[PDB]
Amino acid sequence: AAQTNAPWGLARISSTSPGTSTYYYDESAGQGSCVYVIDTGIEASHPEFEGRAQMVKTYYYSSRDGNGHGTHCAGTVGSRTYGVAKKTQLFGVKVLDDNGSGQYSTIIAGMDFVASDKNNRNCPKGVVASLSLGGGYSSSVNSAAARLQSSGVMVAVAAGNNNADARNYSPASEPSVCTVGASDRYDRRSSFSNYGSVLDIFGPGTSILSTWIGGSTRSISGTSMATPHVAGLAAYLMTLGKTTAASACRYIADTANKGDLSNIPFGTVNLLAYNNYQA
Structure with missing residues (x-):
């Protein structure tokens, strides 16, 4: 399955090259898997989750994501338009x-x-x-x-x-x-x-477009934006039975685009999360 004009990070983890716009993924899209988004909360009412988001625990007065950060990362995980495991x-x-x-x-x-x-x-x-x-x-x-x-x-x-x-x-x-x-x-x-x-x-983590609070969207950056790309990938690869929870970090590194990244300091891996989807 393909998503045209996807966020650059979605297209990136389905490509062996930057600059593309289409996200190619297997239609199962992480069905049967769960991703716990440990953050500021999720606006599960966002139409981009299609009721597939729900708050399970808060540590503050409300479970409302009154920040936006958590709704963004949940969106990068599994939102309809901005997520990896759709x-x-x-x-x-x-x-x-x-x-x-x-x-x-x-x-x-x-x-x-x-x-x-x-x-x-x-x-x-x-x-x-x-x-x-x-x-x-x-x-x-x-x-x-x-x-x-x-x-x-x-x-x-x-x-x-x-x-x-x-x-x-x-x-x-x-x-x-x-x-x-x-x-x-x-x-x-x-x-x-x-x-x-x-x-x-490494995951796409600069200028990541995803869901935001108030049914909106937002583009922000951070390793906090790269982490849901990988979490969504691991959930996607687990629905395919390609890996397990104990192995998924190793599998994703084993199957990552090696060497494509620049400015990787000596001693740090040079791997970009890659779903290796072949139509």
Whole structure:
């Protein structure tokens, strides 16, 4: 299946070259899989989710995404027009306030929730978690994402927008989860994107058009925009039975466009998430 005039990031993860506009994907489109969007919430009422989004837990007074960041990343995961896995289930876990900030105790509690809450859901194709967030290095945040990963959840996290080595940032530095860096529409590393040995993959993360709060759209940037591209891909590749939750980070790296990225500092992988769809 094809989506014409797609967002550049959608077209990128279906191409071996930048500059294209069509997103080529398998029609199953992540049906039967779930992606937990651990963020500021989701505006599930957005017509771009078609009722496939729902809030499952908040850590604040409302489950309303009064920020927009979470609705954006849920959109990049599985929105109709701006998403990778266009048929996936979306579960919102509001751990970030409407300012997009959140304490470590709340973020860890959110990952522990998803680890157990997934046993209440029907995700036959497997469970994915997209963690577009992160602060300074913490062993407690790192071990939480490892716990979530170990429990059978494909955990994808942002490398961080500090333009430094990601080793000093959590959950980015947790070795067992998929740390996602950001590139731009010209196959360069994003100006802001973190790097390092811990990074496992790069995703489209500069000028990402996706859903926003108020039924609108918005184009923003960040490794927080690249992470849902990879989370949606992993959910897509799991519906196809191409990989599993424990392997999906390795599979996506094994099948990524190697070497296309420029300005990748020495020691960081040079891989761009790629669904390898052949009509």
